[PDB]
Ligand binder design. Structure first.
Ligand SMILES: CC(C)(COP(=O)(O)OP(=O)(O)OC[C@H]1O[C@@H](n2cnc3c(N)ncnc32)[C@H](O)[C@@H]1OP(=O)(O)O)[C@@H](O)C(=O)NCCC(=O)NCCS
Ligand SMILES: CC(C)(COP(=O)(O)OP(=O)(O)OC[C@H]1O[C@@H](n2cnc3c(N)ncnc32)[C@H](O)[C@@H]1OP(=O)(O)O)[C@@H](O)C(=O)NCCC(=O)NCCS
Lengths: 261, 258, 261
């Protein structure tokens, strides 16, 4: 009897699809769902097996309608803090993972739902996608990184527009301001997201992971410090065997085959 | 006469730079009065949004007053720049949300004033520009910092190093202007934008503004910790509970600012 | 042999045009090309005359393909490390120079060629312009600051798209995201880039250089620190004759005549 929506996980070798199966509450994130998401992120980040994950919502109405407001109604202040820590840890673990995370936005992504999308590396929007950080219309602020991650993508003026008005934008508006990387044709969201995952997986595993981390770890650094950080990562990747395979494959006019070492 | 006209409407006010004969320039007197206005609205949560515009249809603000500047010794220039910095930072630190309604040319310090505001609305024939290098100076009211943070460093270098004008279509396309207004409707649009913000919960709007700005230049973990500290400002509010009750009752919330 | 130089240098008073004269080799950064490039940057930085430089590649296929991998395979280990270090130093010198650098992107830019474009202050894209940082296809990451320079220009979402998927960005998208400041019509690349340079050099010489550095040095600073930096930079123009001339010209309703002092 308890309301216990959960994730479906579809494994496709180096790529997995995780679907929020919670349509009765528009794929809102409950306490137990967030615990499960964090656990799944930890486990994929301990494999080298899985190199890309697509996260999507079941159905055509909602990617994720935010935190579950029915459950939230009577949560005590410390319980709210614990939930926000779960968002923080989980979203940071997505960023720290060697795996690349793609949000396949199939419908409304509101509040925490947009925050989940912002934590991912890449975003694909279906025609029904709608994004918004609606928190101020609920009496709160974005507490899952939205006040920070949105401005990193769109700048403070557009971030203030969205966050202070709480208005919702459609897929193409999101694309045009740099919030969605791809616009999927109607009916083709998962095919587009999977193809995006394939385009990442064909590249060398450590190079993809290291480049991802170089980008995020440069956040907030002054240029000299950022360049020194990139150089440290570049020197590390020089020692991988895949780096040598890239040079050998080029010298031999053939495709490289990378092993993730 | 006062440097500004003030049209107070309770939680929203409209301030009009009343300086048409100098194209609404930032004289020392204008800057002092602007600071007094910002201080007043920042002293309580009763005024939640302010629209700033220029009188007339020629200029929002033509920048620092260059006739006054000709009379100023170097230490006076430094003092003016310090007061400009303080006033623009006071706009950012204020809980009140500031909307620049750009009714005409916004040049140099005038674009810097617009950039210090939270949101910008432009009339169809309005133009912006940081023209300082064409005057032998650089932006000294934050333009070299706020513009890049807004439109990216390449676009900022274009505008600042060429000193060119940017029109309304370009400004809207790149997000320098958040809204455009039909002719004769600039204030109606800017006031409507203010009303849209004021519909939302008072403490949450102010806290969210500050979370966005205070995250500038932070590394990610520090920025996320900052946001969680800011969330504490709304966690113990009655308005947070009203949001949840309104959702439960399938009705619109009505916030009280506590 | 006559020792054809790696660059053609067209001196036009306050502006120079540098054409990489390597069309048959995709305008690659060979050791010789890098050597000349670094010395050209030093020369224009010390030249009073030269205040802006347009860099372009010969032909319509390549702006600059990056390192010449055929040459690379012949280089000893110390020579490779010296090349990479010299490349990094040259990009930093472009950034620190008072001279304003405009990349006129006439074709494909890859690797170090894209990094060169990113080190410039402004970019103009011909219709054939295409830019990539596709290193993850080779088992490596950018080695000349490309990850950070790209992310600082276009943000982390767009940088992750380009670098993690190893896809190129073409002219219209480059313009939309602020990577290309101008789109040139077919056949008019250099006219557009030269006109952009002319529009910069109309302005006061010290002010232009100081403003360039104020913009660049502020990224990564918290706001109050960034504003303090701008006021320190203002000191560089406060005691100049050109500042007084701007005020006098305004008072006298005439055009200013700047002198770079
Ligand atoms: C996602 C959305 C656009 C879909 O609209 P819709 O298809 O017309 O669906 P409805 O609004 O009628 O909601 C359908 C069910 O989902 C529930 N639901 C929607 N969002 C929910 C959420 N965040 N938490 C818990 N339940 C939610 C509804 O209460 C309703 O269930 P009920 O009839 O048992 O009460 C709409 O539900 C919405 O805007 N939700 C956001 C709620 C919210 O404020 N999130 C905060 C982000 S800060
Ligand atoms: C705003 C502008 C586009 C309007 O053009 P316009 O309607 O044709 O008005 P004018 O240029 O003829 O100027 C009208 C009056 O305003 C004054 N004025 C304009 N800008 C001024 C300024 N920043 N400071 C002091 N006075 C100014 C003019 O000196 C003139 O005064 P006068 O009537 O006593 O001779 C034009 O004034 C302009 O470009 N100003 C920019 C000045 C500047 O360089 N500001 C600093 C940017 S770094």
């Amino acid at each position: 009897g308890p309301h216990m929506p959960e994730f479906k996980v579809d494994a496709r070798g180096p790529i997995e699809i995780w679907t929020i199966d919670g349509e009765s509450r528009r794929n809102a994130i409950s306490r137990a769902m967030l615990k499960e998401l964090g656990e799944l992120v930890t486990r994929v980040s301990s494999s080298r097996d899985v190199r890309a994950v697509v996260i999507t919502g079941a159905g055509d109405k909602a990617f994720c309608a935010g935190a579950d407001l029915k459950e939230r109604a009577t949560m005590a202040e410390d319980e709210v803090r614990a939930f926000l820590d779960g968002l923080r840890r989980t979203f940071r673990a997505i960023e720290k993972s060697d795996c690349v995370f793609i949000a396949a936005i199939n419908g409304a992504a509101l509040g925490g739902g947009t925050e989940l999308a912002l934590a991912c590396d890449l975003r694909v929007a279906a025609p029904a996608a709608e994004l918004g950080l609606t928190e101020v219309k609920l009496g709160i602020i974005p507490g899952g990184g939205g006040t920070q991650r949105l401005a990193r993508l769109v700048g403070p003026g557009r971030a203030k527009d969205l966050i202070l008005t709480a208005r919702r934008i459609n897929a193409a508006e999101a694309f045009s301001v740099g919030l969605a990387n791809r616009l999927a044709p109607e009916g083709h969201l998962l095919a587009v997201a999977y193809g995006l995952a394939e385009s990442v997986v064909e590249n060398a595993p450590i190079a993809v992971a290291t480049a991802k981390h170089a980008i995020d770890e440069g956040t907030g650094l002054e240029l000299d410090d950022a360049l020194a950080l990139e150089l440290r990562k570049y020197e590390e990747i020089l020692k991988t065997e895949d780096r040598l395979e890239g040079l050998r494959a080029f010298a031999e006019k053939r495709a490289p085959v990378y092993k993730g070492r």
